[PDB]
Design a protein around this ligand. Structure first.
Ligand SMILES: N[C@@H](CCCC[B-](O)(O)O)C(=O)O
Ligand SMILES: N[C@@H](CCCC[B-](O)(O)O)C(=O)O
Ligand SMILES: N[C@@H](CCCC[B-](O)(O)O)C(=O)O
Ligand SMILES: [Mn+2]
Ligand SMILES: [Mn+2]
Ligand SMILES: [Mn+2]
Ligand SMILES: [Mn+2]
Ligand SMILES: [Mn+2]
Ligand SMILES: [Mn+2]
Lengths: 308, 308, 308
């Protein structure tokens, strides 16, 4: 029950700023107090500081930041702590997942997102890296990436060892990549048909039939519906509801196999207040904005927070 | 993959105006662009122009309009195009369904609505025709209808060949008609018990056990909850949510047997904005009002639009 | 089909006033008209007027009020009427349930609430009695309660004969009491996993395997999500939705075994308006605040109000 906290305030994978503020906001809202009350101990590492594709925006900053995160996270993973990586946009999952993967070669990844993040630079509508991070992590890139030379000899994640859950906003070319690479995916319609519980059980059975693999959770908060998670940059209608995302995190916690996690795309500047109701009983700041509070509650779920 | 578009701006089946504006609003919002991007071809026909019961409001206008729609739609159906009939209030479904039925004698009808629309003139609380249209189509009327003489020798729809889905606001007498005529109905409580997916599968198995019949979808947008579809004249609490109505249309599209469809009761004047989020990726006008946008997205589902 | 209506305007189990106004507000909104239209007859009794633990707030007022309610309700129960007890905060369920229990010794209780109300005075964070009422009713109190001497020789409710449904906001010590006393409980996560229908069926099978026991429903309106029930003092995120709470009440009505019911924690002063939509068709005041209207609709469900 030791968690290393790593702030990864990278905001270069997409146009906007705001997400760079996520890590410190969550600390302000009571991250340490929440971890404490759940009976975990933490080590807060602070914040990460900061032939070829030529069409990836801000790639220099991203590559240099990612090397730093890769190195820092590798060191925390070696302590056999649970490692919590707080973004930042989703670009931070490349180094997060690959560092975890080098240590846990049988790692299984649950990517929770409204989006596929599985564009390659030649299919991307935007040139924004956060929309390509999963493709990059999966080894789907066809050319070298400037400032990622340090990463070229790493082992990459395999599609069959991954499940994407909650998706509903996929680009035209992206749809083809999704089917082609054989990744396991569960759309919001699958969730509507079968319920979130059956969906995650199905996903886990698919990628870890023997229930014996370490799990990395990469949670993009925009997987959650706008009603509950307004504080994020790229919204898509029809998301996971409050009950669903909480149940999903609880089920993943109960595997007892989660070794690392990203929580990405929280943008405090975009967030709103309810606010404070009696049920906000974790040691979270009164009247905290609702997405920040949800982030902390979802982190609590992964650390074993339960209704009874 | 050819669709005929028929605008049916009838607003006489109920008190309000607004719905007469629906057809052109949907065109403005990007109807043609949406059909194009899905790889369908369209022919836009434009807009329909315009012993006895004595207690039906505006019946002259309704009867005369319905003859015109019957004739116009009959002609489009003969091309073996998919025919999309955009209302207008629900009164336009009488001619829509009966013209389709004369051509497709084994037609099965899925009536998606918060209401039964199955009052007869002697049970109607309002005298508004849009609340009687299904009863009329089913041959449940007991007297002749002024200005409907042209329709008296048509074959009428049978209750056992129909399923009403999503209902929750039914008048006292209407409840008796519903049980008496033996129509298949699936209330919002059935949907809550079994989920939208099991419900539509059950309905389809009930009315088309051999999966071999052409299908007409009559979609009243007020079937959808107020939260997602404010732009409609007669609201009822506890409607289909965004995920449910999208899944329902997708499942119906996947039968590959849908030959015609009404989309009725959209009232642009009553509609509101979110607005524009990243997930609004169909070629729909940026910041379009949310019900209009939903209408277009639901039309896209029927034409095969899917998440991946 | 005779219902006795008892107004129990007790507000001393918690800090706030507002709930004392609930009973008369529901009458103003059309309680009698609703009962009438459902074909029930009512007798409106009006409103109840008004070694040891030393840490229970307002206990004198609560104990004295509870004796009065116990006596009044005992008398109504003897008529073999369905007895509807309208709070007031949840403190009124002690006398309600115990009076019903003395008459119906095989009573089964369905406690519908976001909270456990199962603190004992030595674990209570607040000293507010409404958060202890279920523990008190279950005989879990360890010391005598001032002004409850009249109750000391009553038979208390047993945990195995009780099901709590909808819970999501439970205090730390309370979680231990919940597991220890062996009460049957179904959290919002159980509801999310299995659906409200499977949950209530499971609960009923658990506590009444032979489907032969009288049922008391203790409905705290804060079980319902904030979106639908803002007019209540202690809100918790992720509650039952409009479709769920309506279905739950319908299923309980259909047992045909409900003999008594509390509807508690409605605070008109906290309530808001939609307002009036076509679907508000029960004889409820036009534009009534939404929680009050929901209360009446849920009472209608218990008296057999159904979609068709
Ligand atoms: N598919 C879009 C949207 C990406 C959204 C990124 B994410 O999931 O981290 O918010 C793009 O490639 O630009
Ligand atoms: N049952 C009511 C309401 C009808 C609603 C019509 B509809 O479904 O087209 O909105 C009436 O007969 O007036
Ligand atoms: N557990 C809290 C909250 C109680 C809420 C009471 B109720 O369910 O009637 O709203 C307390 O003991 O103070
Ligand atoms: Mn993402
Ligand atoms: Mn995303
Ligand atoms: Mn209709
Ligand atoms: Mn309708
Ligand atoms: Mn309560
Ligand atoms: Mn409560």
């Amino acid at each position: 029950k030791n968690v290393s906290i790593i702030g990864s305030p990278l905001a270069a994978g997409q146009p906007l700023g705001g997400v760079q503020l996520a890590c410190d906001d969550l600390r302000k809202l009571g991250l340490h107090n929440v971890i404490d009350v759940l009976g975990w101990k933490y080590e807060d590492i602070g914040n990460i500081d900061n032939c070829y594709y030529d069409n990836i925006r801000n790639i220099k900053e991203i590559g240099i930041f990612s090397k730093n995160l890769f190195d820092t996270m590798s060191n925390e993973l070696r302590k056999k702590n649970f490692v919590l990586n707080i973004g930042g946009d989703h670009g931070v999952a490349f180094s997060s997942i690959l560092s975890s993967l080098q240590m846990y070669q049988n790692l299984r990844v649950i990517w929770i997102d409204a989006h596929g993040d599985i564009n390659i630079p030649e299919t991307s509508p935007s040139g924004n890296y956060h929309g390509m991070t999963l493709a990059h992590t999966l080894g789907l890139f066809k050319k070298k990436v400037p400032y990622f030379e340090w990463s070229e000899n790493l082992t990459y994640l395999k599609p069959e060892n991954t499940a994407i859950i909650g998706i509903r906003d996929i680009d035209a070319y992206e749809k083809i990549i999704l089917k082609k690479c054989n990744i396991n995916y569960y759309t919001i319609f699958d969730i509507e048909k079968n319920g979130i519980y059956n969906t995650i059980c199905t996903a886990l059975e698919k990628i870890d039939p023997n229930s014996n693999c370490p799990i990395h959770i990469s949670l993009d908060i925009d997987s959650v519906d706008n009603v509950f998670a307004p504080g994020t940059g790229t919204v898509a209608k029809g998301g996971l509801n409050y009950r669903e995302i909480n149940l999903l995190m609880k089920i993943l916690a109960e595997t007892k196999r989660v070794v690392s996690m990203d929580l990405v795309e929280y943008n405090p500047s975009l967030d709103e207040v309810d606010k404070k109701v009696h049920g906000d009983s974790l040691p979270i700041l009164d009247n905290a904005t609702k997405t920040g509070k949800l982030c902390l509650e979802l982190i609590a779920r992964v650390l074993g927070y339960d209704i009874v």
